[PDB]
Amino acid sequence: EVHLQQSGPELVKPGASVKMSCKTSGYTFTEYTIHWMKQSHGKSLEWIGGIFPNNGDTTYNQKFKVRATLTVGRSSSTAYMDLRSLTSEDSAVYYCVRNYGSSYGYFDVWGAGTTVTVSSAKTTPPSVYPLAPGSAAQTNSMVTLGCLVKGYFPEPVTVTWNSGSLSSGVHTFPAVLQSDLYTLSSSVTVPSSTWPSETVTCNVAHPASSTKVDKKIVPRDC
Amino acid sequence: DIVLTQSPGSLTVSLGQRATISCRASESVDNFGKSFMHWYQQKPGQSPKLLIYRASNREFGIPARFNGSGSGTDFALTINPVEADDVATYFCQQSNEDPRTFGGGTKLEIKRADAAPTVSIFPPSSEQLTSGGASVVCFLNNFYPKDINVKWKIDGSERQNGVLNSWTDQDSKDSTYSMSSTLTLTKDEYERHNSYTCEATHKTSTSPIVKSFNRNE
Amino acid sequence: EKKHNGKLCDLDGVKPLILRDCSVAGWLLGNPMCDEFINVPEWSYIVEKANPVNDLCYPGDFNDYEELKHLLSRINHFEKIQIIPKSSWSSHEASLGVSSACPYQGKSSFFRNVVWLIKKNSTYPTIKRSYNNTNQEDLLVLWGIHHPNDAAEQTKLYQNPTTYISVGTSTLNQRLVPRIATRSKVNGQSGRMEFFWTILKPNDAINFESNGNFIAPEYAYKIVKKGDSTIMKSELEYGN
Amino acid sequence: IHHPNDAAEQTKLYQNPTTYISVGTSTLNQRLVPRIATRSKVNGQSGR
Ligand SMILES: CC(=O)N[C@@H]1[C@@H](O)[C@H](O[C@@H]2O[C@H](CO)[C@H](O)[C@H](O[C@]3(C(=O)O)C[C@H](O)[C@@H](NC(C)=O)[C@H]([C@H](O)[C@H](O)CO)O3)[C@H]2O)[C@@H](CO)O[C@H]1O
Ligand SMILES: *[C@@H]1O[C@H](CO)[C@@H](O[C@@H]2O[C@H](CO)[C@@H](O[C@@H]3O[C@H](CO)[C@@H](O)[C@H](O)[C@@H]3O)[C@H](O)[C@H]2NC(C)=O)[C@H](O)[C@H]1NC(C)=O
Ligand SMILES: *[C@@H]1O[C@H](CO)[C@@H](O)[C@H](O)[C@H]1NC(C)=O
Ligand SMILES: *[C@@H]1O[C@H](CO)[C@@H](O)[C@H](O)[C@H]1NC(C)=O
């Protein structure tokens, strides 16, 4: 396995500088060059540049030659990039990939993908709220449950319920702009007989704010 | 500077029918006897992975259903057959000389039997009242196609603000979409209305299915 | 022309297979030291050092080793397939067949593409395993024979005093017997392993049958593309 | 030398479980043993 990691999500005011990281393992770092790419909300892909760890040879695209900088540390077998004069145009995701060939080959393996964003807005811890199923339309065979996250910043947040015990009806939803606030909802499918026989808890994790919230879905009472 | 134009922009085939995707280049991407164009696939919420390298050879681990052929400036990729676990965005990349360029992407849609959405009406919780706000949200799951309109009735009065509809990708098992219409509210409009409901018109049915609730319950 | 760039890069846009330390015998058998050469894509040529470091981890000899390397000069692609899946050996025991001569994160390990079968319940029932090649392209298989140090070990690992290994395809009949002797200790292990190989044409079957000292194949090698290549000896590295 | 398909044939045609063929001239000594195995069928006959 030649799995490559990256760093976590990044927040910064525009006009400052950022430094991303990429960790390589399972293969020889010297042979294969490391390339980077940018994806603006999935519209398309541009090639930023590539660096050869063997001798530090660097090549760049003319669109990012002004501010992109590539550096490799052989001791730690890691690759980094530096960005200068960040702008709201640069709010996108980046991929750490290794080109197999030499200016003619293909990119074999792609990293997890570190997303970045710039905003003058400070961060906000998430606030999960209960969403109990309706007590009127209760079908003996089928019932729906969920909990919604409101008032958090920035992206992203991962949500899993009951420590990921169930993965049948897990449905997650992307966040939507609302007064420069970020909100999303989630829901799963649970049998009616099993509820509320066993406890159900939906958990939300915010790496930026380092908040771990344990919440219990109380049944609705008339 | 090769610019890649990929057509069709959005492809729709049901299960089992050949799906042809194509893209063209400005000059020839063929040099040294072999055409250097690589095909990439990016599943939703996942990093792209290599499918075809040098436009003919297929990576190990990629099922033999993926076929790529081409020569000169035009290249095509064909998938036989197509199942639910094939929805993704496909790109073709050239590597004749730097800088490398990508295609515009292509969503691969799936045709299937129409499914009636399972609408369920939900009241705002008591915890929300303590926070000083309100949010009533309507859930629409397991329907096809994605073409649907959600409507809001407030005591028989149509209302349009605070509409928050979140789209979602096609499912990889049953190929159905999901919707969630959220109406943000607060303490100066919730306490003067009693009836709230969501109706969604769909080509699968004729009349909009209505699910309603009342505060005094 | 008396000047060269001094690097070692690809030919006609296809990256060569640069074997760093393990060699053809080590890579094809799946040496645990180099697991970065599994599922390798198409290459232009094979580069290996004059004196490989990790070659035939367990002591022994590769039968017709130079014959196989001649074939690799004309093959430009290899693919792994599940010819005989593991965990299918319900009678014989496959996991415990590991030797201390091959370290891997401090564990004793073995080759990836071969499996060492030993007795499980003090019995070694005879196996009749046959594989039919439905693939259109030519298929490559390879197995091996284990030569124990003494008769004490033979009963210890295989329970059969006299054992045989019979491999039969359309154009190959072969009875193999273990050649017990007293040998010196290289890589820390006195026993020796003699691995074999053969080329399986499409729509042809190879039949294995043994009651001890058998090394069943685990992954088989497809021959997708045949072209021109050379196995050069050099200590140079990739130059991009 | 005839190599039978299996032990069943060996007893069927030659009646000797273990057989040998020895050819000896002035400059050639040779012990030959039948190498029983399971082979594919070419020209309609499995034996070789
Ligand atoms: C130094 C010495 O020989 N003194 C012995 C010491 O070796 C012996 O331990 C066993 O000795 C045998 C015979 O050489 C092997 O060395 C054994 O090692 C293993 C190995 O690690 O390679 C264990 C391994 O599990 C074995 N494989 C299987 C199928 O189990 C292999 C394999 O049998 C051999 O490589 C083939 O000959 O051998 C080692 O444990 C000790 C204990 O009896 O006594 C000293 O006097
Ligand atoms: C490995 O498997 C293949 C296929 O499973 C074997 O192919 C065999 O090929 C022969 C010759 O074409 C087939 O005989 C013919 O079969 C057809 C269809 O059954 C029949 O209509 C003809 O009258 C003729 O009998 C044979 O059926 C086919 N075997 C199958 C399909 O199972 C191949 O022989 C196998 N390898 C070895 C070494 O046996
Ligand atoms: C792919 O299709 C082309 C023609 O469309 C054909 O020539 C080729 O053999 C096919 N490749 C595979 C691997 O089936
Ligand atoms: C070995 O076989 C015997 C039956 O002869 C059985 O009782 C025993 O459990 C077996 N050994 C193991 C480890 O299962």
Side-chain angles (χ1 to χ4, degrees):
Chain A
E1 294 190 357
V2 298
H3 187 13
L4 312 178
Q5 303 288 349
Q6 298 185 12
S7 292
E10 284 181 22
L11 61 83
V12 65
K13 318 293 149 71
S17 180
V18 301
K19 184 206 180 66
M20 278 162 52
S21 166
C22 185
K23 175 65 179 290
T24 61
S25 56
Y27 79 112
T28 77
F29 191 51
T30 78
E31 269 185 5
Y32 305 93
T33 188
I34 298 298
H35 287 223
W36 291 83
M37 285 160 196
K38 183 179 180 182
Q39 188 171 70
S40 188
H41 51 282
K43 68 181 268 202
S44 64
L45 288 168
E46 312 85 286
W47 171 62
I48 292 171
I51 186 165
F52 194 24
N54 192 16
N55 51 1
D57 272 7
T58 67
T59 175
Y60 293 82
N61 185 21
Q62 285 308 311
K63 293 205 56 186
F64 306 97
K65 180 57 178 303
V66 292
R67 56 209 187 293
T69 303
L70 267 70
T71 316
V72 294
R74 297 183 300 180
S75 70
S76 294
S77 70
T78 51
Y80 316 94
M81 190 187 314
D82 287 328
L83 275 299
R84 310 153 155 130
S85 299
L86 273 296
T87 300
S88 83
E89 182 65 26
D90 310 318
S91 300
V93 76
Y94 296 84
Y95 292 134
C96 173
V97 304
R98 44 157 269 194
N99 177 24
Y100 186 79
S102 64
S103 176
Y104 285 89
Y106 46 90
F107 307 91
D108 204 291
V109 191
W110 295 53
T114 287
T115 185
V116 309
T117 176
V118 292
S119 290
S120 65
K122 300 180 180 180
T123 178
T124 307
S127 68
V128 62
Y129 302 111
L131 184 57
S135 313
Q138 287 219 0
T139 90
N140 283 4
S141 48
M142 186 65 160
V143 63
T144 60
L145 194 157
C147 66
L148 188 153
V149 191
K150 185 161 209 82
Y152 80 97
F153 201 95
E155 298 311 298
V157 286
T158 177
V159 60
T160 182
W161 309 358
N162 292 319
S163 75
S165 70
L166 60 90
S167 50
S168 67
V170 296
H171 292 37
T172 188
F173 278 67
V176 193
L177 295 174
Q178 178 44 72
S179 72
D180 203 330
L181 273 292
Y182 283 10
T183 55
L184 73 165
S185 58
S186 186
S187 66
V188 308
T189 60
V190 59
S192 314
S193 299
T194 64
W195 188 83
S197 76
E198 67 263 11
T199 179
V200 292
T201 48
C202 73
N203 292 10
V204 288
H206 190 192
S209 295
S210 179
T211 59
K212 304 289 185 181
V213 192
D214 285 348
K215 186 254 168 194
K216 170 70 193 87
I217 303 105
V218 60
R220 187 167 284 119
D221 48 349
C222 183
Chain B
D1 292 335
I2 297 87
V3 64
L4 277 297
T5 53
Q6 184 172 82
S7 176
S10 300
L11 188 153
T12 309
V13 287
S14 63
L15 275 53
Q17 298 71 13
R18 176 180 300 266
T20 302
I21 195 66
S22 64
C23 72
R24 298 173 66 75
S26 303
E27 51 285 30
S28 187
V29 300
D30 189 358
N31 194 359
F32 296 108
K34 285 158 292 200
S35 46
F36 297 112
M37 185 180 287
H38 323 300
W39 282 101
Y40 283 172
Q41 153 182 350
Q42 172 189 34
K43 293 180 178 297
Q46 284 185 257
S47 62
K49 67 169 184 178
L50 167 70
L51 286 194
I52 304 297
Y53 62 92
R54 300 190 192 96
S56 177
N57 295 318
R58 181 174 62 260
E59 184 143 54
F60 177 84
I62 304 305
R65 308 174 293 112
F66 294 90
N67 188 358
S69 176
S71 177
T73 75
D74 56 355
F75 297 82
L77 174 74
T78 59
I79 300 168
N80 315 311
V82 186
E83 51 275 60
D85 186 74
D86 272 333
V87 61
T89 306
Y90 295 78
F91 315 95
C92 56
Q93 186 195 132
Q94 66 77 19
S95 64
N96 219 349
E97 72 285 36
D98 294 301
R100 331 285 180 82
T101 49
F102 283 86
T106 294
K107 290 294 204 60
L108 188 153
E109 289 293 20
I110 296 285
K111 261 169 49 174
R112 64 141 305 170
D114 291 331
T118 74
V119 61
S120 177
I121 189 63
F122 292 99
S125 71
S126 194
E127 162 53 63
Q128 293 177 335
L129 279 73
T130 63
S131 54
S135 288
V136 62
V137 65
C138 306
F139 282 27
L140 283 137
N141 286 11
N142 285 32
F143 67 98
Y144 188 84
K146 62 169 193 169
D147 253 338
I148 190 167
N149 193 3
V150 57
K151 277 308 297 173
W152 281 78
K153 287 313 288 177
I154 317 292
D155 298 345
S157 55
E158 198 168 346
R159 179 60 178 163
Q160 299 181 359
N161 194 8
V163 285
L164 300 170
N165 187 17
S166 170
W167 273 255
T168 195
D169 63 358
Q170 205 172 179
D171 187 74
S172 284
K173 302 165 177 257
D174 73 350
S175 294
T176 54
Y177 297 77
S178 197
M179 295 297 212
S180 80
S181 175
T182 300
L183 208 73
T184 176
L185 295 171
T186 181
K187 296 302 289 182
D188 52 343
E189 70 275 30
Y190 195 12
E191 297 181 355
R192 289 177 177 88
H193 294 89
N194 169 53
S195 175
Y196 315 84
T197 181
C198 279
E199 61 277 355
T201 183
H202 209 290
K203 60 179 65 62
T204 310
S205 50
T206 73
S207 87
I209 176 164
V210 177
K211 284 294 300 312
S212 199
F213 79 100
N214 44 41
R215 182 178 292 171
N216 284 74
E217 60 98 18
Chain C
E1 272 285 342
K2 309 173 295 302
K3 61 203 271 192
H4 51 83
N5 58 7
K7 304 171 187 176
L8 188 153
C9 49
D10 47 13
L11 189 143
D12 287 335
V14 298
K15 163 167 197 308
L17 196 149
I18 303 184
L19 286 165
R20 301 278 309 302
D21 280 330
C22 51
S23 73
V24 164
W27 158 55
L28 289 177
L29 278 162
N31 218 1
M33 294 300 293
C34 59
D35 278 308
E36 71 182 41
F37 298 123
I38 54 178
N39 304 2
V40 61
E42 179 188 28
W43 68 85
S44 179
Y45 46 93
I46 298 170
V47 174
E48 66 173 57
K49 313 257 182 158
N51 274 316
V53 176
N54 290 318
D55 184 12
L56 270 168
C57 172
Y58 202 92
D61 184 33
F62 206 104
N63 194 274
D64 285 335
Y65 178 48
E66 281 73 12
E67 273 314 317
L68 177 49
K69 303 174 64 175
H70 199 267
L71 267 71
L72 298 204
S73 297
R74 282 65 181 272
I75 298 177
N76 277 1
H77 207 169
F78 266 114
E79 206 181 9
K80 286 189 177 332
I81 49 170
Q82 198 77 263
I83 178 169
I84 300 183
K86 205 152 63 177
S87 81
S88 178
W89 306 103
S90 47
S91 312
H92 314 259
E93 200 180 36
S95 65
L96 286 188
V98 301
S99 177
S100 178
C102 293
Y104 192 46
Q105 293 83 18
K107 300 294 187 291
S108 305
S109 178
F110 206 56
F111 307 110
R112 304 302 174 211
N113 310 119
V114 298
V115 61
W116 190 0
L117 303 174
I118 66 177
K119 75 181 191 193
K120 169 184 292 298
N121 201 6
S122 295
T123 44
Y124 201 102
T126 318
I127 53 172
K128 307 185 80 196
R129 296 305 271 261
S130 66
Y131 179 77
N132 180 356
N133 181 18
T134 64
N135 308 340
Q136 299 179 0
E137 68 275 16
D138 302 6
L139 197 155
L140 168 61
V141 296
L142 73 165
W143 63 98
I145 302 299
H146 174 245
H147 299 316
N149 318 349
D150 49 352
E153 196 173 30
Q154 181 65 46
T155 303
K156 174 183 179 180
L157 303 178
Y158 306 94
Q159 202 55 57
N160 291 10
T162 299
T163 74
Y164 66 96
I165 294 93
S166 63
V167 179
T169 193
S170 64
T171 61
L172 186 157
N173 59 82
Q174 169 182 90
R175 179 53 61 85
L176 295 169
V177 298
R179 284 183 298 171
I180 305 185
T182 43
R183 317 171 196 84
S184 184
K185 288 186 181 177
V186 298
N187 279 357
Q189 287 294 338
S190 62
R192 303 271 187 281
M193 290 187 174
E194 183 158 63
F195 292 91
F196 296 88
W197 67 272
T198 196
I199 288 287
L200 198 62
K201 286 167 205 64
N203 282 351
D204 194 7
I206 173 164
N207 298 7
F208 294 109
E209 185 192 291
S210 168
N211 54 2
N213 299 130
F214 190 39
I215 300 294
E218 182 65 26
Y219 289 82
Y221 276 128
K222 286 156 136 166
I223 305 181
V224 175
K225 276 181 282 293
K226 313 209 61 170
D228 286 326
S229 81
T230 48
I231 308 192
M232 293 183 284
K233 276 21 173 193
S234 55
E235 278 81 350
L236 294 176
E237 53 178 33
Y238 200 63
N240 207 42
Chain D
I1 302 299
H2 174 245
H3 299 316
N5 318 349
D6 49 352
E9 196 173 30
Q10 181 65 46
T11 303
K12 174 183 179 180
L13 303 178
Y14 306 94
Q15 202 55 57
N16 291 10
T18 299
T19 74
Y20 66 96
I21 294 93
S22 63
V23 179
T25 193
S26 64
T27 61
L28 186 157
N29 59 82
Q30 169 182 90
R31 179 53 61 85
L32 295 169
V33 298
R35 284 183 298 171
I36 305 184
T38 43
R39 317 171 196 84
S40 184
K41 288 186 181 177
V42 298
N43 279 357
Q45 287 294 338
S46 62
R48 303 271 187 281

